[PDB]
């Protein structure tokens, strides 16, 4: 599914998505537009180290989810990589939330910080009534 901007910014909010971990719900949207273009089916292959990231916020699964073809694997969030390709987020909020409960917090994904870190990112959801 390829979400429109405001309805994913609600569906975010009703997650509790906004301010988790001090992560504003504008730098989410801002994460989710670069990593997959708000589409949850998006897959990308990393053929130097062999890990694929999956759905919308582009989740790697040699560390969060498990796709069983990943070497030096791990899975911290515990889950199938095929959850993370389903039309319902929920999978998909409760992996980038285990994802910001380590150290580096949003700074996990380089993708924020080339496109995300130190702009103005309220137009990501200005006009969506969140």
Same mark, same amino acid.
Not at 6 to 11: G, M, P, Y
Not at 75 to 97: E, M
Not at 104 to 119: D, E, K, L, S, Y
């Given at each position: 599914?390829?979400?429109? /901007?405001?309805?994913?910014?609600?569906?975010?909010? !009703?997650?509790?998505?906004? +301010?988790?971990?001090? *992560?504003?719900?504008?730098? =989410?949207?801002?994460?989710?537009?670069?990593?997959?273009?708000?589409?949850? /089916?998006?897959?990308?292959?990393?053929?130097?180290? !062999?890990?694929?990231?999956? +759905?919308?916020?582009? *989740?790697?699964?040699?560390? =969060?989810?498990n796709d069983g073809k990943t070497?030096?694997?791990?899975?911290?969030?515990?889950?199938?990589?095929?959850?993370?390709?389903?039309?319902?987020?929920?999978?998909?909020?409760?992996?980038?939330?285990?994802?910001?409960?380590?150290?580096?917090?949003?700074?996990?994904?380089?993708?924020?910080?080339?496109?995300?870190?130190?702009?103005?990112?309220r137009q990501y959801v200005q006009?969506?009534?969140?």
């Amino acid at each position: 599914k390829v979400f429109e /901007r405001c309805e994913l910014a609600r569906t975010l909010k !009703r997650l509790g998505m906004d +301010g988790y971990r001090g *992560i504003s719900l504008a730098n =989410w949207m801002c994460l989710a537009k670069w990593e997959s273009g708000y589409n949850t /089916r998006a897959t990308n292959y990393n053929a130097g180290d !062999r890990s694929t990231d999956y +759905g919308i916020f582009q *989740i790697n699964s040699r560390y =969060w989810c498990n796709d069983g073809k990943t070497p030096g694997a791990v899975n911290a969030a515990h889950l199938s990589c095929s959850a993370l390709l389903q039309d319902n987020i929920a999978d998909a909020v409760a992996a980038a939330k285990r994802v910001a409960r380590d150290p580096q917090g949003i700074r996990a994904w380089v993708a924020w910080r080339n496109r995300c870190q130190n702009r103005d990112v309220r137009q990501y959801v200005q006009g969506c009534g969140v």
